CSV table of C-alpha atoms in Angstrom, one decimal:
chain,number,residue,atom,x,y,z
A,5,UNK,CA,-6.4,-0.1,18.6
A,6,UNK,CA,-5.2,-3.8,18.5
A,7,UNK,CA,-8.7,-4.9,19.6
A,8,UNK,CA,-10.2,-3.8,16.3
A,9,UNK,CA,-8.1,-6.3,14.4
A,10,UNK,CA,-8.6,-9.7,16.3
A,11,UNK,CA,-10.9,-11.0,13.6
A,12,UNK,CA,-11.7,-10.6,9.8
A,13,UNK,CA,-12.3,-6.9,9.1
A,14,UNK,CA,-14.1,-5.7,5.9
A,15,UNK,CA,-12.0,-3.3,3.8
A,16,UNK,CA,-13.0,-0.5,1.4
A,17,UNK,CA,-10.4,1.2,-0.8
A,18,UNK,CA,-11.1,4.3,-2.9
A,19,UNK,CA,-8.5,5.9,-5.1
A,20,UNK,CA,-8.7,8.9,-7.5
A,21,UNK,CA,-5.7,9.3,-9.7
A,22,UNK,CA,-4.3,11.6,-12.4
A,23,UNK,CA,-1.1,10.4,-14.3
A,24,UNK,CA,0.2,12.7,-17.0
A,25,UNK,CA,-3.4,14.1,-17.4
A,26,UNK,CA,-4.9,10.6,-17.6
A,27,UNK,CA,-7.5,10.5,-14.8
A,28,UNK,CA,-8.9,7.3,-13.3
A,29,UNK,CA,-10.6,5.9,-10.2
A,30,UNK,CA,-10.3,2.6,-8.5
A,31,UNK,CA,-12.6,1.0,-5.9
A,32,UNK,CA,-11.5,-2.0,-3.9
A,33,UNK,CA,-13.4,-4.3,-1.5
A,34,UNK,CA,-12.4,-7.3,0.5
A,35,UNK,CA,-11.2,-8.2,3.9
A,36,UNK,CA,-8.2,-8.2,6.2
A,37,UNK,CA,-7.1,-10.7,8.7
A,38,UNK,CA,-4.3,-9.2,10.8
A,39,UNK,CA,-4.0,-12.3,12.9
A,40,UNK,CA,-2.5,-14.0,9.8
A,41,UNK,CA,-1.3,-10.9,8.0
A,42,UNK,CA,-3.7,-11.7,5.2
A,43,UNK,CA,-5.4,-9.3,2.7
A,44,UNK,CA,-7.9,-10.4,0.1
A,45,UNK,CA,-9.1,-7.7,-2.2
A,46,UNK,CA,-10.6,-7.1,-5.6
A,47,UNK,CA,-10.2,-3.8,-7.3
A,48,UNK,CA,-12.2,-2.3,-10.1
A,49,UNK,CA,-11.2,0.6,-12.3
A,50,UNK,CA,-14.5,2.5,-12.0
A,51,UNK,CA,-13.7,5.0,-14.9
A,52,UNK,CA,-13.2,2.2,-17.4
A,53,UNK,CA,-9.7,1.4,-18.6
A,54,UNK,CA,-6.8,1.9,-16.2
A,55,UNK,CA,-4.3,4.1,-17.9
A,56,UNK,CA,-1.3,2.7,-15.9
A,57,UNK,CA,-0.3,-0.9,-15.1
A,58,UNK,CA,-2.1,-2.4,-12.1
A,59,UNK,CA,1.1,-3.4,-10.3
A,60,UNK,CA,2.2,0.3,-10.0
A,61,UNK,CA,-0.8,0.9,-7.8
A,62,UNK,CA,-0.5,-2.0,-5.4
A,63,UNK,CA,1.5,-0.2,-2.7
A,64,UNK,CA,-0.9,2.8,-2.8
A,65,UNK,CA,-4.1,0.7,-2.6
A,67,UNK,CA,-3.5,-0.8,4.7
A,68,UNK,CA,-0.5,-1.7,6.8
A,69,UNK,CA,-2.7,-2.0,9.9
A,70,UNK,CA,-3.3,-5.5,8.6
A,71,UNK,CA,0.3,-6.6,9.0
A,72,UNK,CA,0.9,-9.4,11.4
A,73,UNK,CA,2.9,-8.1,14.4
A,74,UNK,CA,4.1,-11.1,16.5
A,75,UNK,CA,3.4,-10.8,20.2
A,76,UNK,CA,7.0,-9.8,21.1
A,77,UNK,CA,6.6,-6.9,18.7
A,78,UNK,CA,3.1,-5.6,19.8
A,79,UNK,CA,4.8,-2.5,21.2
A,80,UNK,CA,5.9,-1.5,17.7
A,81,UNK,CA,2.6,-1.5,15.9
A,82,UNK,CA,2.0,2.2,15.1
A,83,UNK,CA,-0.6,1.4,12.5
A,84,UNK,CA,-3.2,-0.3,14.8
A,85,UNK,CA,-2.5,2.0,17.7
A,86,UNK,CA,-3.7,4.9,15.5
A,87,UNK,CA,-7.1,3.2,15.2
A,88,UNK,CA,-10.0,3.8,15.1
A,89,UNK,CA,-9.3,7.5,14.3
A,90,UNK,CA,-6.6,6.4,11.8
A,91,UNK,CA,-3.6,7.9,10.1
A,92,UNK,CA,-2.5,9.9,7.1
A,93,UNK,CA,-0.2,8.1,4.7
A,94,UNK,CA,1.8,10.1,2.2
A,95,UNK,CA,4.3,8.9,-0.3
A,96,UNK,CA,6.6,9.9,-3.1
A,97,UNK,CA,7.1,7.1,-5.5
A,98,UNK,CA,10.0,7.7,-8.0
A,99,UNK,CA,10.1,5.3,-10.9
A,100,UNK,CA,13.7,5.1,-12.0
A,101,UNK,CA,14.2,6.8,-15.3
A,102,UNK,CA,10.6,7.8,-15.4
A,103,UNK,CA,7.9,9.8,-13.6
A,104,UNK,CA,6.8,10.2,-10.0
A,105,UNK,CA,3.7,9.4,-8.1
A,106,UNK,CA,2.7,11.5,-5.1
A,107,UNK,CA,-0.1,10.1,-2.9
A,108,UNK,CA,-2.0,11.2,0.1
A,109,UNK,CA,-4.3,8.8,1.9
A,110,UNK,CA,-6.4,8.6,5.0
A,111,UNK,CA,-6.8,5.1,6.6
A,112,UNK,CA,-9.4,4.8,9.3
A,113,UNK,CA,-12.5,3.0,10.4
A,114,UNK,CA,-15.9,4.1,9.1
A,115,UNK,CA,-18.3,2.1,11.1
A,116,UNK,CA,-16.9,-1.5,11.2
A,117,UNK,CA,-15.1,-1.0,7.9
A,118,UNK,CA,-11.4,-0.2,7.5
A,119,UNK,CA,-11.3,2.5,4.8
A,120,UNK,CA,-8.3,3.6,2.7
A,121,UNK,CA,-9.1,6.8,0.7
A,122,UNK,CA,-6.4,8.0,-1.6
A,123,UNK,CA,-5.5,10.8,-4.1
A,124,UNK,CA,-2.7,10.1,-6.4
A,125,UNK,CA,-1.0,12.5,-8.8
A,126,UNK,CA,1.6,11.4,-11.3
A,127,UNK,CA,3.8,13.5,-13.6
A,128,UNK,CA,6.8,13.4,-15.9
A,129,UNK,CA,6.2,9.9,-17.2
A,130,UNK,CA,7.5,8.9,-20.6
A,131,UNK,CA,4.9,8.0,-23.2
A,132,UNK,CA,7.0,5.0,-24.2
A,133,UNK,CA,8.4,4.1,-20.8
A,134,UNK,CA,7.5,1.0,-18.8
A,135,UNK,CA,4.5,2.6,-17.1
A,136,UNK,CA,2.6,4.6,-19.8
A,137,UNK,CA,3.9,1.9,-22.2
A,138,UNK,CA,2.3,-0.9,-20.3
A,139,UNK,CA,5.5,-3.0,-20.3
A,140,UNK,CA,5.3,-4.3,-16.7
A,141,UNK,CA,4.5,-7.9,-15.9
A,142,UNK,CA,1.2,-8.6,-14.1
A,143,UNK,CA,2.8,-9.9,-10.9
A,144,UNK,CA,4.5,-8.6,-7.8
A,145,UNK,CA,7.7,-9.2,-5.8
A,146,UNK,CA,8.4,-9.5,-2.1
A,147,UNK,CA,9.9,-6.6,-0.3
A,148,UNK,CA,11.8,-5.5,2.9
A,149,UNK,CA,9.8,-2.4,4.1
A,150,UNK,CA,11.9,-0.6,6.7
A,151,UNK,CA,9.9,1.2,9.3
A,152,UNK,CA,11.4,3.9,11.5
A,153,UNK,CA,9.9,6.3,14.0
A,154,UNK,CA,9.7,10.1,13.4
A,155,UNK,CA,9.5,11.0,17.1
A,156,UNK,CA,9.1,14.7,16.5
A,157,UNK,CA,6.1,14.1,14.1
A,158,UNK,CA,4.4,11.6,16.4
A,159,UNK,CA,4.5,9.1,13.5
A,160,UNK,CA,6.6,6.8,11.3
A,161,UNK,CA,8.6,6.8,8.1
A,162,UNK,CA,9.2,3.9,5.6
A,163,UNK,CA,11.7,3.6,2.8
A,164,UNK,CA,11.8,0.8,0.3
A,165,UNK,CA,12.5,0.0,-3.3
A,166,UNK,CA,9.7,-1.8,-5.2
A,167,UNK,CA,10.8,-4.1,-8.0
A,168,UNK,CA,8.4,-4.2,-11.0
A,169,UNK,CA,9.3,-7.0,-13.4
A,170,UNK,CA,9.5,-5.9,-17.0
A,171,UNK,CA,8.3,-8.0,-20.0
A,172,UNK,CA,11.9,-8.3,-21.3
A,173,UNK,CA,13.3,-9.6,-18.1
A,174,UNK,CA,14.6,-6.3,-16.9
A,175,UNK,CA,13.4,-4.6,-13.7
A,176,UNK,CA,11.7,-1.2,-13.2
A,177,UNK,CA,12.6,0.2,-9.8
A,178,UNK,CA,10.2,2.3,-7.8
A,179,UNK,CA,11.7,4.1,-4.8
A,180,UNK,CA,9.1,4.7,-2.1
A,181,UNK,CA,9.4,7.5,0.5
A,182,UNK,CA,6.6,7.2,3.0
A,183,UNK,CA,5.4,9.2,6.1
A,184,UNK,CA,2.5,8.3,8.4
A,185,UNK,CA,0.9,10.6,11.0
A,186,UNK,CA,-2.1,9.9,13.3
A,187,UNK,CA,-5.3,11.7,12.5
A,188,UNK,CA,-6.6,11.9,16.1
A,189,UNK,CA,-5.2,13.2,19.3
A,190,UNK,CA,-4.9,10.0,21.3
A,191,UNK,CA,-1.5,8.4,22.0
A,192,UNK,CA,0.2,6.2,19.5
A,193,UNK,CA,3.1,3.7,19.6
A,194,UNK,CA,6.4,4.9,18.2
A,195,UNK,CA,8.4,1.8,17.2
A,196,UNK,CA,12.0,0.8,17.2
A,197,UNK,CA,13.4,0.2,13.8
A,198,UNK,CA,12.0,-2.9,12.1
A,199,UNK,CA,10.6,-4.1,8.8
A,200,UNK,CA,7.4,-5.4,7.2
A,201,UNK,CA,8.0,-8.5,5.1
A,202,UNK,CA,5.6,-8.5,2.2
A,203,UNK,CA,4.4,-10.9,-0.5
A,204,UNK,CA,1.6,-10.5,-3.0
A,205,UNK,CA,0.1,-12.4,-5.9
A,206,UNK,CA,-2.0,-10.7,-8.6
A,207,UNK,CA,-4.7,-12.6,-10.5
A,208,UNK,CA,-7.9,-12.1,-12.6
A,209,UNK,CA,-11.5,-13.0,-12.0
A,210,UNK,CA,-12.8,-15.1,-15.0
A,211,UNK,CA,-16.3,-13.6,-14.6
A,212,UNK,CA,-15.2,-9.9,-14.5
A,213,UNK,CA,-15.8,-7.9,-17.6
A,214,UNK,CA,-14.4,-4.7,-15.9
A,215,UNK,CA,-10.7,-3.8,-15.7
A,216,UNK,CA,-9.8,-5.2,-12.3
A,217,UNK,CA,-7.2,-6.8,-10.1
A,218,UNK,CA,-7.5,-9.6,-7.6
A,219,UNK,CA,-4.9,-9.3,-4.9
A,220,UNK,CA,-3.8,-11.7,-2.2
A,221,UNK,CA,-1.2,-10.4,0.2
A,222,UNK,CA,0.6,-11.6,3.4
A,223,UNK,CA,2.7,-9.3,5.6
A,224,UNK,CA,4.5,-10.1,8.8
A,225,UNK,CA,6.5,-7.7,10.9
A,226,UNK,CA,10.0,-8.7,12.0
A,227,UNK,CA,13.5,-7.4,12.8
A,228,UNK,CA,13.5,-7.1,16.6
A,229,UNK,CA,15.1,-9.9,18.7
A,230,UNK,CA,12.9,-11.8,21.2
A,231,UNK,CA,13.3,-10.3,24.6
């Protein structure tokens, strides 16, 4: 598993979504450099106009590209599931607003790491921060707490995403995540630890389509050396 990530790996992301009856698709392409924890991707809304704010999709749109330091190699579930990959499911509850539920498969297709997602969102308020497009086009850094689910041969993650709002308030998005290998081969079940994330969101001046340029660094931590 770890051997597949020693260099720069091309990435394809494909998302189909439906939020309050507003359907959309997003296609992302770029590359991942797990050695440095670095993702560079550009996403296009392939159905035209994205009906939700781009930052609310960042977490759904490849934790196998986290940098696990050598003393933590034993705790990298994500890469150990490769190339056959893993299923990633979440419930994302936007405080005072609706919920996303997502199911994704992350695996190699040829030499490309591919994340294919279906997202369903319900119960959003027409005038809330999401359907109202009141979120800033930016992203915060988070503490993503990983724990093993030993009886499901997989992991769980819990974290609270902070989406900055245009009036200076914050929109919270509680994330409940479960990952399960796709194949039958053995995987690593980690001790408790966290993924330390940071992201920046930008635009391509030459892009006429609705899009998002994303740069992201993630490093694993939380286990003492030795």
